[PDB]
Short mmCIF file of C-alpha atoms and ligand atoms in Angstrom, two decimals:
data_model
loop_
_atom_site.label_atom_id
_atom_site.label_comp_id
_atom_site.label_asym_id
_atom_site.label_seq_id
_atom_site.Cartn_x
_atom_site.Cartn_y
_atom_site.Cartn_z
CA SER A 1 -14.50 -7.17 -63.66
CA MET A 2 -15.10 -3.78 -61.67
CA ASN A 3 -13.11 -1.03 -60.01
CA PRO A 4 -14.27 0.38 -56.96
CA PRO A 5 -15.61 3.86 -56.71
CA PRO A 6 -12.68 6.19 -56.14
CA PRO A 7 -11.88 7.61 -52.63
CA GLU A 8 -14.01 10.45 -51.35
CA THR A 9 -13.15 14.00 -52.68
CA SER A 10 -16.14 15.78 -51.64
CA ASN A 11 -18.26 15.64 -48.60
CA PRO A 12 -20.06 18.75 -47.15
CA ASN A 13 -20.33 17.47 -43.40
CA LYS A 14 -16.50 17.36 -43.29
CA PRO A 15 -15.00 20.36 -41.65
CA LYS A 16 -12.34 22.15 -44.05
CA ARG A 17 -9.75 24.58 -43.60
CA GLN A 18 -7.19 26.24 -45.69
CA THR A 19 -3.69 26.49 -44.07
CA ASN A 20 -0.61 27.96 -45.47
CA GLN A 21 0.75 24.33 -45.34
CA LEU A 22 -2.04 23.03 -47.21
CA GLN A 23 -1.40 25.66 -49.78
CA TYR A 24 2.11 24.97 -50.11
CA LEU A 25 1.18 21.03 -50.63
CA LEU A 26 -0.72 21.96 -53.74
CA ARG A 27 1.34 24.92 -55.10
CA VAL A 28 4.87 23.32 -54.70
CA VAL A 29 4.58 19.52 -53.71
CA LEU A 30 1.91 18.18 -55.67
CA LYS A 31 2.61 20.76 -58.56
CA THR A 32 6.28 19.45 -58.69
CA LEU A 33 5.56 15.62 -58.18
CA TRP A 34 3.14 16.03 -61.11
CA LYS A 35 5.45 17.16 -63.57
CA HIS A 36 8.06 14.41 -62.92
CA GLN A 37 8.53 11.89 -65.87
CA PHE A 38 7.58 8.98 -63.58
CA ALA A 39 4.27 10.71 -62.18
CA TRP A 40 2.09 9.28 -64.99
CA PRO A 41 0.79 5.83 -63.47
CA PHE A 42 0.10 7.70 -60.20
CA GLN A 43 -1.85 10.69 -61.67
CA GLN A 44 -5.16 8.67 -61.50
CA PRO A 45 -6.61 5.63 -59.68
CA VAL A 46 -5.13 2.30 -60.61
CA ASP A 47 -7.63 0.96 -63.41
CA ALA A 48 -7.29 -2.77 -62.39
CA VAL A 49 -9.74 -3.75 -65.10
CA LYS A 50 -7.78 -2.06 -68.00
CA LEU A 51 -4.50 -3.60 -66.42
CA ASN A 52 -5.67 -6.94 -66.29
CA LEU A 53 -5.08 -7.03 -62.40
CA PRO A 54 -8.08 -8.58 -60.91
CA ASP A 55 -6.54 -9.32 -57.29
CA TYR A 56 -5.44 -5.55 -56.89
CA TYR A 57 -8.33 -4.35 -55.08
CA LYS A 58 -8.44 -7.42 -53.04
CA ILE A 59 -4.89 -6.82 -51.94
CA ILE A 60 -5.13 -2.87 -51.57
CA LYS A 61 -8.03 -1.81 -49.42
CA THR A 62 -6.93 2.15 -48.98
CA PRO A 63 -6.34 2.87 -52.46
CA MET A 64 -4.75 6.39 -53.04
CA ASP A 65 -3.37 8.31 -56.09
CA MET A 66 -2.23 11.91 -56.83
CA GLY A 67 -5.31 12.77 -58.96
CA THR A 68 -7.46 12.07 -55.87
CA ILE A 69 -4.94 14.16 -53.93
CA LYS A 70 -4.98 17.09 -56.63
CA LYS A 71 -8.78 16.89 -56.24
CA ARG A 72 -8.81 17.11 -52.43
CA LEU A 73 -6.21 20.01 -52.41
CA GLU A 74 -8.02 22.03 -55.13
CA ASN A 75 -11.38 21.22 -53.76
CA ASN A 76 -10.63 22.06 -50.15
CA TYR A 77 -11.19 18.69 -48.40
CA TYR A 78 -8.55 18.74 -45.65
CA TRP A 79 -8.56 20.19 -42.37
CA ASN A 80 -4.57 19.89 -41.92
CA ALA A 81 -1.59 19.22 -43.94
CA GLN A 82 -0.96 15.89 -41.95
CA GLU A 83 -4.18 14.40 -43.82
CA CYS A 84 -2.64 15.30 -47.09
CA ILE A 85 0.74 13.80 -46.17
CA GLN A 86 -0.73 10.49 -44.98
CA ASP A 87 -2.32 10.40 -48.25
CA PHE A 88 0.68 10.52 -50.40
CA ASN A 89 2.29 7.82 -47.80
CA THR A 90 -0.70 5.68 -48.65
CA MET A 91 -0.08 5.67 -52.29
CA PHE A 92 3.42 5.08 -51.83
CA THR A 93 3.05 2.11 -49.48
CA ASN A 94 0.30 0.46 -51.48
CA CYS A 95 2.51 0.57 -54.48
CA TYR A 96 5.44 -1.12 -52.36
CA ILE A 97 2.78 -3.60 -50.93
CA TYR A 98 1.24 -4.63 -54.13
CA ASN A 99 4.48 -4.80 -56.46
CA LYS A 100 7.93 -6.58 -56.06
CA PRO A 101 11.12 -4.46 -54.86
CA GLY A 102 12.87 -3.75 -58.02
CA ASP A 103 9.91 -3.40 -60.16
CA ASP A 104 10.03 -0.62 -62.46
CA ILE A 105 6.72 0.67 -60.84
CA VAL A 106 8.57 0.55 -57.62
CA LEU A 107 11.41 2.46 -58.87
CA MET A 108 9.05 5.06 -60.18
CA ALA A 109 7.29 5.43 -56.89
CA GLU A 110 10.59 5.20 -55.06
CA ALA A 111 11.77 8.36 -57.07
CA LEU A 112 8.66 10.34 -56.54
CA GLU A 113 8.97 9.63 -52.71
CA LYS A 114 12.44 10.93 -52.55
CA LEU A 115 11.26 14.02 -54.18
CA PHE A 116 8.38 14.19 -51.94
CA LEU A 117 10.35 13.95 -48.60
CA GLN A 118 12.88 16.84 -49.98
CA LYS A 119 9.99 19.11 -50.53
CA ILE A 120 8.17 18.20 -47.19
CA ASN A 121 11.50 19.45 -45.55
CA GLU A 122 10.75 23.20 -46.67
CA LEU A 123 7.05 22.80 -45.41
CA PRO A 124 6.22 26.40 -44.00
CA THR A 125 5.55 26.75 -40.45
CA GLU A 126 2.01 27.16 -38.80
C1 LIG T 201 0.92 2.79 -59.62
C2 LIG T 201 0.77 1.35 -59.54
N1 LIG T 201 0.61 0.65 -58.39
O1 LIG T 201 0.56 -0.77 -58.91
C3 LIG T 201 0.20 -0.69 -60.19
C4 LIG T 201 -0.10 -2.07 -60.83
C5 LIG T 201 0.54 0.40 -60.75
C6 LIG T 201 0.32 1.03 -62.21
C7 LIG T 201 -0.70 2.06 -62.14
C8 LIG T 201 -0.89 2.54 -63.57
C9 LIG T 201 -0.11 1.76 -64.42
O2 LIG T 201 -0.04 2.23 -65.88
N2 LIG T 201 0.66 0.64 -64.36
C10 LIG T 201 1.38 -0.14 -65.46
C11 LIG T 201 2.93 0.10 -65.23
C12 LIG T 201 3.54 1.64 -65.17
C13 LIG T 201 4.76 1.88 -65.20
C14 LIG T 201 5.56 0.86 -65.09
C15 LIG T 201 5.11 -0.63 -65.08
C16 LIG T 201 3.95 -0.62 -65.12
C17 LIG T 201 0.87 0.34 -63.11
#
């Protein structure tokens, strides 16, 4: 079995822009989630080969993880904070779609997401 190629993190044709909101997403949001004790399953793409989950990529067609998000923030992939926010939301929603409610992995995604939303409430203007 095989894993797909990861989501794009470099593309010279895509316009990029630093915003103070993006900077906050990296400095504060990502940094804080990354260190949480339930971050580890979300720090890289789901390795469905290693995990013996051969249907994962038949079910989840827009994969996303905090590894990818960290690369997209550190090498400036985004034009705005909403694109980055959508990546986080995709990662969470994928977990809730693939797994069952009350699964441990779901409880872990849920704790991250709660923290994510708290941090998003302090997103600076502009
Ligand atoms: C994240 C994620 N979403 O769906 C799956 C499957 C994973 C995932 C990623 C790495 C990963 O190691 N797992 C196994 C695991 C981790 C914590 C608790 C229970 C099971 C699962």
